[PDB]
Design an enzyme around this catalytic site. Structure first.
Site, PDB file in Angstrom:
ATOM      1  CG  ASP B 290      -2.103  -1.010   0.993  1.00  0.00           C
ATOM      2  OD1 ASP B 290      -2.501  -1.241  -0.172  1.00  0.00           O
ATOM      3  OD2 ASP B 290      -2.606  -1.558   1.991  1.00  0.00           O
ATOM      4  CE1 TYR B 374      -6.584  -4.624   2.324  1.00  0.00           C
ATOM      5  CE2 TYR B 374      -5.429  -3.126   0.750  1.00  0.00           C
ATOM      6  CZ  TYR B 374      -5.762  -4.437   1.201  1.00  0.00           C
ATOM      7  OH  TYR B 374      -5.318  -5.578   0.575  1.00  0.00           O
TER       8      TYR B 374
END
Ligand SMILES: [Cu+2]
Ligand SMILES: [Cu+2]
Ligand code: NA
Ligand code: NA
Ligand code: NA
Ligand code: NA
Lengths: 620, 620
Positions: B290, B374
């Site tokens: 990420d 997320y």
């Protein structure tokens, strides 16, 4: 009308009268423990019978007694004379705290030891320390305390800064005899003071802290009924208080739509022990069972609004007995309040365009106790999402010694010539489980790593395995942080909407357990502390992991004896005992008064609900 | 005037102009990363030179470039053409998020797969997923994204509830070609919705929550100067922001009487990876960096007063570049506030009669980011007593799949026919240490158990051992919770008043590290994640544990290559890299939106001060 209500002053006064009339409370008697007994299994009779258990000490040397009384019926149910060489001595009495110092002050051996050090006897404080069981045959069946000395330069001085090392005494507090005085040599008494309110040590106080105001303009979100029954954000429970254990939580349940679902029948810290790791003969006997030997509930502090508990606080003031059976209120001894707890759930979605945020909060139930140099805060937390957490906060003043010239492998230096022995603070939580009812089982869950190969060609797969603990002999378990080990308490007869058994997962902090050699006295007396998790079958009389009478008990009582019954625990009424603790190598920053350090555990729902239980929380 | 100030809009506009004039920013160019470079070691010249690093992508297929620019002098310092088959592809662009879905919507193989499932192409969302490096030789040197499909029944529907399993596609986003479409079979698309704002799913909202009001009637206790310099309760630091790393803390120091004492030169979360443990070919390639692949800073949320941050909040609004070099403000992207934190220290003394209580507080610096499904909150905490703590808060929507009939060893069931694959969320903290200056060393500290015997006759002693890590080849360390293992960063040339080196102790949570097989692609590309602690010698260009260009990099870059230099780290300028993570077996309670779970670490002073540093805190 609830059977789980706090003891009242009138109940304790009635116990006193019943004991007095039965001839059990003469001038030579002292109450060492008094507490209300929980209802027996199957209380669906509504026939209230409030019973109290009492330990009665005799200062004349007669045998102590254990007595059970019914205050509703006004009768003595049973009274048994105790053979203390067999089953253990009674807990230390508050009035014995001064007796050790007073007896030593007239002993010629003690006075000669003080004279060689040029210490005035009027300035020497002696700590009343529990004795344990070691090599001294003359102590069997006698009520012994040991004494270590600290100098107070003036009445408001912190004696902990001035340990008198190389000197220890043993005293028989019933016969009023000093049995041994051991002087292994003269150590300089550390001279720096540790007075943390002295401006010369603090410097000028900060003027930079601006106020934080926490208020609830509409009052708190919880209700208290029947004195100690709490309802808060779908949680339901009763807050009890016992002079040995402190705050006890009963009947923890969660309102899931139409149904009140039980989770935990009774939660308590059932023992705590502080073993010291200094091999000097002056201190190598030191292991304080703050709960079992001293009773942490009787030393609970009165908590001050704004200082100890901040916000919109609801207090409980529990009532206990003094040594003569008079009721004594601990004013503001329990704080209850809710706290904001940050973000609960949050998502901003790239496809739906919906931005969603909800805040969390927790209910706090806490008390603070002081045992000699130690101060401990006990905190129970209930969260919106079904999580239950316990946290111990350790502070106070570290127990000190001299720091030997040339150093030590077992003592930290805090100040010139001032040492602090290594030690642990180890707790036992007793969780009488009731996940959706009483048919429960425990599974140990480990992460499973998988080898690259057929069916896992890219070597990315990993899994988990669950092992059911079926009998008590296989339910003594150790932590394994590297394999992510947790334990799941489930109800095999209660399924969620996916046809899986409902459960809760216990997450440990995976701190070291008891470090002492397994052949040591403390490993035998605190056997619970050598393993992280024990599961037993529920039994009325299996209350403490160390047994009923911990003081000077030779060992093996409690959990090792219980699990020898090898009872079925697979879908039965079970009790989880979790060991957790702090290993304390004191640092300079812990002196002269120690900033809080913490340890604890938590339980989280694991398929207990059919989906997130906080979808109905509004948007602030 | 500070060199650590946040990037300004004018600085980014100047970078755009410099790049444009140099011929480096034509219509085919996109900025994939832009960030300010930290000052070189030895900034005691006061000669400010604000330099920016830029990664420039070319949508026509030309080679990308790495460029360094000086905005103070208006010049290009260096510009290097990148061979991406060698050194890795550039981070994913926000504008590529839509390209995968749009390219697949005209591919006959994709359309045939959707037609067999009776899914309307206009309702099918395709996630733009990073590709990794696997067996497909045609992908080397090409910019590939992979796509997994989710159905949206209507524009505000949560697509995550409707995964299309058995189907995956690979796309070349530069040539605009669909390289492969893999259809392993028809799975029913789960039909229940996951709309957590739908009243039919939430039920009636609670009316039981009463307000908690947190205010500071005199304002906050911290000051902000120069835009991003914070002073709070003896702490001093600068709050930076980088589009890749997010919030970065610089120059963390503590005012100890007369002296400003450094502790940490630079603290950041330098990488984070989400490896999935499902061996299905549809998902066995899934590992999302990420930070390194997507850049968590560019997706930082605007934080709302009262909802995201509660209390007296001070905001920073960092400025970043868009893909064309225009400045873009993230309004209210960083929250700063102080929080009450319970009891700091407490003691009631039986001999002095003094009752003492002090309250703790912490300074909070936080931001929240969203990457697809997320959402992560990053929290840095500074406490009164010198403790520094980091906490990650994970929430959002779990990544879903079908739940196979007959079950799965690698997927949890959340709803009828709806699964969630097992995965981890693993972070790397990069701590460029400066304990009292730059001469630091790391020691590993283990508890030492001792055998009963001579010198330990009662079997109670225990101790500790410290091992100095002297060279990089021996500084790759694993956790050991059972031995209480911690790491101490000390300064051997700076002693406290007891003549001991000053230090800070790192306390890990001891969660499992990377579970993948050591021969896997992800173990090679995320080698940092296989060990808990790495120590390197500081070097300007050693910024990330995974290297500069993580996307589609074949592996071994970053930490394994750095430590091969085997540099001296014993009393030198060193960097600590700590791996920590969550292992997520999703539960029913995580659906349809997940309650926050947390992981982190903390550092506590270890003989850094000469006594407790909070003796001058006033009594509220
Ligand atoms: Cu301690
Ligand atoms: Cu997850
Ligand atoms: Na015995
Ligand atoms: Na039970
Ligand atoms: Na390569
Ligand atoms: Na450094």
């Amino acid at each position: 009308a609830s059977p789980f209500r706090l003891a009242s002053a009138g109940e304790i006064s009635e116990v006193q009268g019943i004991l007095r009339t039965a001839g059990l409370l003469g001038p030579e008697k002292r109450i060492a423990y008094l507490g209300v007994l929980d209802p027996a299994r199957g209380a669906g009779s509504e026939a209230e019978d409030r019973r109290f258990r009492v330990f009665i000490h005799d200062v004349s040397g007669a045998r102590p007694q254990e007595v059970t009384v019914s205050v509703t019926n006004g009768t003595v149910i049973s009274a048994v004379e105790l053979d203390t060489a067999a089953t253990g001595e009674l807990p230390v009495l508050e009035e014995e705290f001064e007796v050790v110092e007073q007896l030593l002050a007239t002993d010629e051996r003690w006075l000669k030891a003080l004279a060689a050090r040029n210490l005035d006897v009027s300035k020497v404080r002696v700590a009343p320390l529990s004795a344990g069981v070691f090599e001294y045959a003359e102590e069997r069946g006698r009520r012994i305390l040991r004494g270590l000395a600290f100098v107070q330069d003036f009445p408001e001085d912190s004696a902990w800064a001035h340990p008198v090392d190389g000197l220890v005494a043993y005293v028989d507090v019933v016969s009023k005899e000093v049995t041994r005085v051991i002087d292994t040599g003269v150590f300089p008494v550390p001279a720096e003071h540790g007075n943390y309110t002295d401006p010369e040590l603090t410097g000028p106080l900060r003027t930079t802290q601006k106020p934080i105001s926490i208020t609830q303009p509409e009052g708190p979100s919880f209700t208290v009924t029947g004195g100690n029954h709490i309802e808060w954000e779908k949680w339901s429970l009763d807050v009890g208080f016992d002079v040995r254990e402190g705050v006890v939580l009963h009947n923890i349940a969660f309102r899931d739509g139409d149904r009140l679902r039980p989770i935990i029948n009774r939660a308590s810290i059932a023992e705590m022990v502080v073993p010291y790791g200094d091999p000097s003969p002056i201190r190598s006997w030191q292991n304080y069972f703050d709960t079992g030997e001293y009773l942490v509930g009787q030393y609970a502090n009165s908590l001050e609004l704004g200082c100890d508990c901040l916000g919109d606080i609801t207090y409980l003031s529990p009532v206990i007995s003094d040594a003569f059976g008079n009721p004594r209120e601990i004013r503001n001894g329990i704080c209850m309040h809710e706290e904001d707890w940050g973000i609960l759930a949050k998502h901003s979605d790239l496809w739906s365009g919906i931005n969603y945020t909800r805040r969390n909060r927790r209910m706090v139930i806490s008390f603070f106790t002081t045992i000699g140099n130690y101060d401990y805060g006990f905190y129970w937390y209930l969260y919106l999402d079904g999580t239950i957490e316990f946290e111990a906060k350790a502070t106070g003043v570290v127990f000190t010694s001299a720091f030997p010239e040339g150093g030590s492998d077992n003592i930290s230096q805090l100040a010139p010539g001032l040492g602090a022995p290594f030690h642990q603070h180890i707790f036992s939580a007793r969780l009488d489980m009731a996940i959706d009812g009483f048919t429960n089982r425990v599974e140990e869950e480990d992460v499973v790593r998988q080898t690259m190969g057929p069916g896992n060609e890219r070597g990315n797969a990993f899994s988990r395995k669950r092992t059911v603990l079926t009998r008590e002999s296989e339910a003594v378990r150790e932590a394994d942080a590297r394999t992510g080990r947790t334990w799941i308490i489930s109800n095999p007869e209660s399924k969620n909407r996916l046809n899986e058994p409902v459960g809760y997962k216990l997450h440990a902090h995976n701190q070291p357990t008891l470090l002492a050699d397994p052949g040591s006295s403390i490993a035998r007396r605190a056997a619970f502390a050598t393993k992280d998790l024990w599961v037993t079958r529920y039994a009325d009389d299996e209350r403490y992991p160390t047994g009923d009478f911990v003081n000077q008990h030779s060992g093996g009582a409690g959990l090792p004896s219980y699990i020898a019954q090898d009872r079925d625990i697979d879908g039965q009424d079970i009790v989880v005992w979790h060991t957790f603790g702090l290993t304390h190598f004191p640092r300079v920053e812990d002196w002269p008064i120690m900033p809080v350090d913490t340890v604890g555990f938590k339980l989280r729902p694991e398929g207990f609900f059919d989906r997130s239980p906080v979808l109905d929380v509004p948007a602030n």
